[model samples]
Target: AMKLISKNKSLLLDRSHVMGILNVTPDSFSDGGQFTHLDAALKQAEKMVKAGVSFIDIGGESTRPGAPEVSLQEELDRVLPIIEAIHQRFDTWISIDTSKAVVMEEAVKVGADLINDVRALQEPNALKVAAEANVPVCLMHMQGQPRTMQTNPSYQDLFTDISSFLSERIDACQSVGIAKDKLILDPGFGFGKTLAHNYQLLAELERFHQFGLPLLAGMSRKSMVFKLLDVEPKMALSGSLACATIAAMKGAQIIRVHDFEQTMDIVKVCQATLEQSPH
Candidate 1:
């Protein structure tokens, strides 16, 4: 039973929760430039809320493979107003998906409840900023940078290395005053993994709960599904929902996804089934 606090409000992560992905960048892999405008972004946030997302993850930078870096000011300008507006309009949790220290600091100031850092807060000043914000931090395991991570990634043992890296990151966060319980772990499905690696991690997702912290699964329409199935992003909804359902059944506390309505259906059914189990 892990709990996370944001602005004195807390949430229980005992069961599966959905964190809807809302990319505000110009070139995210899946849905970018669709919600860059403030009004459009708010409309999307409302949709996520109406669809019953536990949190709305707003990101300005694109972490897709081969994606370039976004300037600090550009990222800030892109995400802050949206975060502020969504906070004002919705009571659901807000998550800032960024690796920059400045964005983390500003987003939390504007009412971001969670920090989802794909770099695991190893960026300059990021660990310190997350610590100061005092919000729940999601540490993701990536083998390398987004630009070239997929080029030639190899690990002695994928799951062990991921677990070790996330454990080290948890220690790093704790050293900076971020509590252990206020953290979430993400295995980073496609950030730097091959198709086999991604599925293997998914099949063994339950191993992540060994840390006793909440786990976040972000395999929404990523290469893990699209590439393997030889399908387009829009055509990967059923695959995404299948992955989401498996993650939920495997004890993932948060499933970060794109299609809120469809994914929520998968989550609800999986939660209901998991709850009905006796053992």
Candidate 2:
């Protein structure tokens, strides 16, 4: 089992845990502007906690394709209050999904238990701040900036390229003071990946276990599901569950998703199946 430790909290990944996506941004692709209000965000948090979610991933800035950049103060303003309120009310783990240094510093000060960076902490001072915070950091791979990541997402040997990127990020974390155990890897299913690339990554998800760290798969209600099925995000629950099942079966420690109850059920069944299967 893998243990993700922060200052005073630790989460054990004995089985695939569900990390529910709670985007506070007004422009997120899936549920934009839905939970931007503090009361609504708290309500969603309450629902997910009751549904047995392991983590609540809060993102202030939308990283969807061609998303506009949010200023530091604006980003903090959008997420800090929600994080503080959730921390005060909820008993579950909170993950701050951002790449800014100050956001990482401030969010941890309030409540965030994990740093889920789609940029892998490459932003200026992000590495230093995360090291100083001493929290579990989930480094995700994105080929280009969010503004134009999908315009022409070409990868040289998809798996190898992503693997190398993750390996380098892992090294960067350790080089600073983020211990090996405080790190997590995410293949970034819909971020900067084409439909073919996304499915290929999903099929070969287990290959990421070579890094010897807990893996996080976040296909959720992404375009990889909606676009493929030619349906809207609201109608993509079936596709999202399929992706979640595939990821859980491949041994992903954390399955990030927007559909909490359904994905949690899938994780439970996958855990049972894995327990009975030969290792």
Candidate 3:
């Protein structure tokens, strides 16, 4: 059993699990402004728990392509209270979706179980904070900063570049006293990629497992789905579920999604089918 940041709790990675997305921000890509309020956030957390989510990722800042930056204080104010309340009310793990040093430090203090950084802890002092927190950290790969990541993003070779980047971040963390097993990797589906880039990443999602760490695929309602399907993010549920299922089948350990129940069902079906398949 893998231990969580919370001493009493642990994680079992024998199979794929769903991670419910809790955006405690006013301008996240899809569900922004929906759960900024305490009651709504709490209600959504409760729903995710009932839906059997392994954890909930609470993001205060928006990392969508072309998104604006959030002030440190603003981000702190938005996520901390919700993190505290969720930890108090829920038994499952809580992952703080931030790259700020202080945010990671304060959030873990208030009961965040993991740090999911879209920038992969390259931000100043973030590595130090994560190392000291001693919690699991999800390092995502983005071609550039959020405000400009999607603007004319390119890669020499998608897989090679991404693999190299993640490896460097892993090294950075390890050098800072963070253990190898305490790290997770995310391909960062829509953070900085075009239609083909996203699909190719998903098609080869299993390649990331060579690092010997858990994989998190955050493709829910992203442009990769809605843009290809010619639909809006809100209407991309079916497309998102398709990607989530494929990721699970491709050996993704955690599937982060917007719709709790639907995504959970998809992951369950994928896990069950994969388990029964003849080797």
Candidate 4:
């Protein structure tokens, strides 16, 4: 279980909960530009909120392969208004997906409750900004940037490599005086990983839980599922749900997903049975 802070209300997530993806970029691998205008974005947020999503992850920049770098002004133009609108209209938490120091401070100023950074704040000034904000942050493990991350990425030891990366990054955060209570760890599925390496990491993901921090599994609509199933992103929802279901069964505390309703059902039913099943 991991502690979560929402609107100054802290809750321990002993079981799996959904963190819905709300990508505000035109190039996001999934759900990109589906929310083009403010109204469209609000409608999408409404759907997730109505479906019982707990967090809406809003991102202006695309971390997907070959996604063009979006400037701060452009990112703000794309993501801020939507954040403000959702904060005003919904009762759920908002997660800002970014690696920029400016974006982190700006997003927090507006309405974001959590910071989800793919670069793990290794980007210049990112850690400083996050430390200053004092909000819960999800630091992820990626071998490279989006542009060349997936181009023949390699790892000597998948689990050990990931574990070390996460440890070092958290230590970096802690060295800057960021409290451990405000930290979360992400294995970063599909980011800079070969398909085999991705599976290896997934199989060994439970190792990270030893840190006694919240573990976030973000295998939602990712290539690892599609590539293995020989399908597409639109066709990989079932695979994603299965992976998420198994993640909860293992030890994952928060399942970051794009399809909330289905995942919510999967977690509730599967966990119920697992809790009562034979040892």
Off by over 4 Å in 3: 1-6, 26-36, 62-71, 144-156
- Per-model TM-score, in order, reads 0.87, 0.86, 0.86, 0.85
- What digit string (tens of lDDT, one per residue) describes model 2 on residues 205-267? 898888888999999889999999999988999999999999999999999999999998999
Residues 104-128 of candidate 4: C-alpha lDDT, one tens digit per residue: 9998888888999988898889999
Better of 1 and 3 by TM-score: 1
How would you encode candidate 1's per-residue C-alpha lDDT over 1-279 as one tens digit per residue? 777777678888778889999988654433332344677788889999999899999988654557656667767777888899999888999999989898889989989999998888999999999889988888887865322234455422555566668678877877988888888888778866678778878988898888777899999999899998899988999899999999999989899999889988988899789889997
**Weakest 10 consecutive residues, lDDT, candidate 4?**
26-35
Q: Give the TM-score of candidate 2.
A: 0.86
Ranking by lDDT: 2, 1, 3, 4
In model 4, state the lDDT of residue 136.
89
Lowest summed lDDT across 10 adjacent residues in model 2 is found at 27-36
> Once superposed on the true structure, which residue ranges of model 4 sit more than 4 Å away at CA?
26-36, 62-70, 143-156, 277-279
With candidate 4 superimposed using the best TM-score fit, by how many Å does residue 49's alpha carbon deviate from the native?
A: 1.5
TM-score, candidate 1, is 0.87
lDDT of each: 0.83, 0.84, 0.81, 0.80
Task: Report backbone clashes per prediction.
Answer: 0, 0, 0, 0
**lDDT tens readout by residue for model 3, 1-279:** 243344567787877888898887654433322344667788889999998999899988654556556677777877888889989988899999878898899999999998989888889999898888888888887765322234455522555566678678777877988877888888788866778778877887888887778888999999999999999888999999999889989979888899989988887898789879997
How many Å off is the CA of 168 in candidate 4? 2.6
Candidate 2 regions with alpha-carbon error over 4 angstroms? 26-36, 62-71, 144-156
C-alpha displacement of 173 in model 3, angstroms? Answer: 1.5
| Per-residue lDDT of 21 in model 1 | 91
Q: Estimate candidate 2's alpha-carbon lDDT, on a 0 to 1 scale.
A: 0.84
